[PDB]
Amino acid sequence: TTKESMGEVMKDSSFALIEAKYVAGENIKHIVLENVQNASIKVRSRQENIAG
Amino acid sequence: IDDVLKLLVEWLCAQLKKPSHPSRGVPVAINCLAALLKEPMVRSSFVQADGVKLLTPLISPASTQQSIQLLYETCLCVWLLSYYEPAVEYLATTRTLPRLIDVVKSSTKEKVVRVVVLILRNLLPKGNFAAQMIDLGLPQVVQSLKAQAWSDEDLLEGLNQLEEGLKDNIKRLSSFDKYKQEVLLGHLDWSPMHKDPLFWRDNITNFEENDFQILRVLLTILDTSSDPRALAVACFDLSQFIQYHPAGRVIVTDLKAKERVMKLMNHENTEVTKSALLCIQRLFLGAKY
Amino acid sequence: SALIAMIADEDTVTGFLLAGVGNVDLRRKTNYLIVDSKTTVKAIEDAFKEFTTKEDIAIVLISQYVANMIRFLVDSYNKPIPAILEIPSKDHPYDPAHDSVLSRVKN
Amino acid sequence: TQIPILTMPNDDITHPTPDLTGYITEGQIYIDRQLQNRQIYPPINVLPSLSRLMKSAIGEGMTRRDHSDVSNQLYANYAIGKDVQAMKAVVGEEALSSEDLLYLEFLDKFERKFVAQGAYDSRNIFQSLDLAWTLLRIFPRELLHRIPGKTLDQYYSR
Amino acid sequence: GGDFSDPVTSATLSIVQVFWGLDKKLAQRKHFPSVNWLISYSKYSTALESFYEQFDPDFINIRTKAREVLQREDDLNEIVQLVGKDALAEGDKITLETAKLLREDYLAQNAFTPYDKFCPFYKSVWMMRNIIHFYNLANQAVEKGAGMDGQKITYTLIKHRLGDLFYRLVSQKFEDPAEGEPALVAKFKKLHEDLTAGFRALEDETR
């Protein structure tokens, strides 16, 4: 199911880049790089024993 | 002819024939000693060893231009001594070694400085007194020699190798090997951190980077320790680290160091119990001021 | 913890790097920027084996497996958690090939 | 003092001759076909080997005070190592724990250096006991639970 | 070593009421008492009920609990050898801890040392009572399993929080009976009181 969602995920993502080009044109680039309003890259993973 | 040379003080007399010239017997005697260094018995004979102590004052000053040649002769004698182990023992008994180091530091002749450095490198044997003097020299004399590179590039490379060897030998007993074998290895043992509170703080500095990651690993190892003795050493190290920093004590209490203290806190063994109680008490003392 | 790509099409990666904080999974302070195509992306696999496997960053990213040069990370199928990645399009539609997790996931 | 060598007919012990000999004789030393297969000149397998009067045989004059501790520790370590080797075989070499690999390594060094001896190797008991303490100190002090602490302190570091 | 179906053996076990069947597996394990606790049996058990009641009423129940623990350990030994300790839960963990404690402290008696040469019945019953009490307290603790913690977490905690009492339980065998029954009883009562204090503070902390 997740793989099926994959690819369509990138197709949806391309619309964000198109909208950015239409509205703000070129991104901030360099360290800033713009184009991000949410989803800061921070995670939390843990090994869980399932079925032993 | 070692006995003949020892019993014939005519050698020391020709060496003491000052009115003849500055180096008349001295250069001749130095050349004879260098030639006899080919035979290990001649080099290591007590007759040669006896003159080494008598020549200890001559090792220190080389102010005169003639004394510069005398300094080179002394360096050749030093190399000959490095050849013979009994001569090495006599030189260890002989003084002016730190004086020789200072003279080499104040060496106008780069060849003489290179010879002195070569002699020091040939003294690969410990010789704790000269080793400590070189450790004092290594911070200053070796650093200046590296700054004051001159003459042969091969001599400079040899000096760099000698400096690297001196740096390796420095703090050979007080090295990080004990701390690595105790805390890092996971089987706790004698560690520099437990020995001194300053060393404990120094080890904790590397230990606490992200929420005391290395200290957290050590605490996790100590918590699940079947052996009380290794648990005792780990808990003692944890107590020292906690007492080093008050906030660090609270951090350790948050980590498995409190779990390690709770483990074997009042067990049948006494050392483990005492170390765990010390760790817990240090954590509590760091929790509130 | 985090996830560092350090090489990708970077079109969606820049928008997914960071907005407020988290240091973009330390891709700026450490590792490498998500941008790619300037050098060989085999170095991306090397960084994933080095940086992502260093427990700081869980996952990585590679695009379309065509110019991603992800065949170097083909042996990275073992230990999925240190090396897990799926090929998105990001203007370069995914092409199934030997990659970090593509062979295992497809099979 | 008699040492009657006995031949197991079909390489067994339930046969009447070895059975009655065990009933009568106060000891038994085993020579193992498995040991011979790996080409060890003395094939003695210590696990079934036993002397009823070994405790009285060893003495403070005869041997060091820790000799009995050495024997007990070697017995326990060998038995646990054999069980651990079977467990690792059934579950897998990788699945074996750290102490499992330690026990297998102890078995290896034991059957390699300890049992093996030359056609004319004639060594006194003391150096053999010292090398046995080397093999025992290969294991950690905690794992040497059978050994009393005093004998360990006497001959663990050495 | 031989089969226990041997005619002499079969004839004896028919009439004899108590079989203290020794096991070789213990013998190469250097477990000196070498008494197997599976094959052995004492049919005289019901007769001594009056003596046990007049001596210590709780002794019978703790003996049954120890027997059940030993049986559980022997039963699941095959499984843990087969599948592995990974699937073992907190109950299995405490059961194995108690089984090892039995095998080391209780069933093993060197008898070559003054503390272990002779074991008076008061010392024996007290050691078994302490072990069974620790087992019961561990069971209650892992059963509570509240406050976003407990169960296997509680077992690991008490391993690293009450491991001191765990080691002192093993040391309890080393208490020399020659010191006298009053002193030994006082020491064992203090140990039981501290064991009750254990898993009570652990109950108080709620993990």
Side-chain angles (χ1 to χ4, degrees), chain A residues 2 7 16 18 20 24-25 39 51-52, chain B residues 14 19 22 25 27 29 34-35 40 49 51 57 61-62 86-87 92 98 125 127 130-131 137 139 147 149 158 165 186 192 197 228 230 232 234 246-248 257 276 286-287, chain C residues 2 5 8 15 19-20 22 43 47 58 67 80 82-83 88 93 96-97 102, chain D residues 1-7 9 12-18 20-25 27 29-31 33 35-36 40-44 46-53 56-59 61 63 67-68 70-71 74-76 78-79 81 84 86 89-93 95 101-104 106-107 109-110 114-116 118-120 122-123 125-126 128-129 131-141 144-149 151-152 156-157, chain E residues 1-2 4-5 7-22 26-29 31-42 44-48 50-52 54-55 57 59-64 66-67 69-72 76 79-80 82-84 87 89 91 94-96 98-99 101-103 105-108 111-115 118-121 123-127 129-139 141-142 145-147 150 155-158 160 162-171 173-174 177-178 180-186 188 191-192 196-199 201 205-206:
Chain A
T2 316
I18 299 288
Chain C
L102 196 149
Chain D
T1 308
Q2 62 185 359
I3 309 295
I5 80 178
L6 188 152
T7 313
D12 58 349
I13 307 99
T14 45
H15 185 80
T17 303
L20 300 175
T21 298
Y23 270 81
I24 296 151
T25 50
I29 301 315
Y30 293 61
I31 294 91
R33 292 212 75 105
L35 271 296
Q36 181 56 255
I40 297 97
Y41 159 69
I44 295 92
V46 308
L47 188 153
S49 287
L50 175 54
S51 179
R52 299 181 191 170
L53 281 159
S56 68
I58 53 175
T63 49
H67 186 280
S68 66
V70 175
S71 160
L74 283 170
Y75 291 166
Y78 208 58
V84 163
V90 58
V91 310
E93 270 320 288
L101 300 180
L102 294 176
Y103 267 104
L104 267 76
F106 159 77
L107 304 172
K109 321 184 189 76
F110 187 80
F114 186 90
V115 179
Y120 301 112
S122 184
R123 185 70 192 92
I125 188 70
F126 273 97
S128 293
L129 210 58
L131 296 177
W133 278 100
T134 71
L135 213 55
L136 285 187
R137 76 186 70 186
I138 286 170
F139 277 166
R141 275 219 177 106
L144 302 170
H145 43 285
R146 191 36 61 103
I147 312 194
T151 50
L152 282 173
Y156 189 80
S157 43
Chain E
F4 287 159
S5 57
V8 34
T9 315
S10 73
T12 48
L13 277 70
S14 63
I15 53 176
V16 180
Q17 304 260 359
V18 173
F19 180 27
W20 288 331
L22 307 176
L26 278 188
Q28 70 274 16
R29 212 204 96 193
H31 187 280
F32 309 101
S34 66
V35 175
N36 182 241
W37 54 98
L38 275 298
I39 63 174
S40 306
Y41 72 101
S42 45
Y44 283 131
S45 44
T46 186
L48 289 175
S50 315
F51 164 77
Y52 280 155
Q54 75 95 47
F55 186 82
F59 172 67
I60 300 96
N61 286 319
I62 69 170
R63 193 190 74 254
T64 58
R67 289 283 263 277
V69 162
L70 270 177
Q71 174 58 40
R72 190 73 185 83
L76 69 90
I79 302 189
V80 65
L82 175 69
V83 188
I94 56 177
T95 318
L96 271 50
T98 53
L101 183 59
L102 266 295
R103 273 175 271 113
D105 187 77
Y106 203 60
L107 295 202
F112 325 118
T113 63
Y115 54 84
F118 171 79
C119 165
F121 189 36
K123 186 195 145 154
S124 176
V125 62
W126 267 116
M127 293 182 286
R129 178 139 64 198
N130 299 355
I131 299 171
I132 293 306
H133 205 68
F134 157 76
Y135 171 71
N136 295 329
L137 294 174
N139 287 291
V142 299
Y155 151 76
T156 57
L157 182 62
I158 62 174
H160 319 316
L162 276 297
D164 68 334
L165 293 181
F166 189 72
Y167 192 37
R168 185 175 76 151
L169 283 171
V170 175
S171 75
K173 74 154 292 183
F174 292 100
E181 274 296 335
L184 269 295
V185 167
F188 293 144
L191 197 146
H192 191 274
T196 59
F199 312 101
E205 67 186 356
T206 73

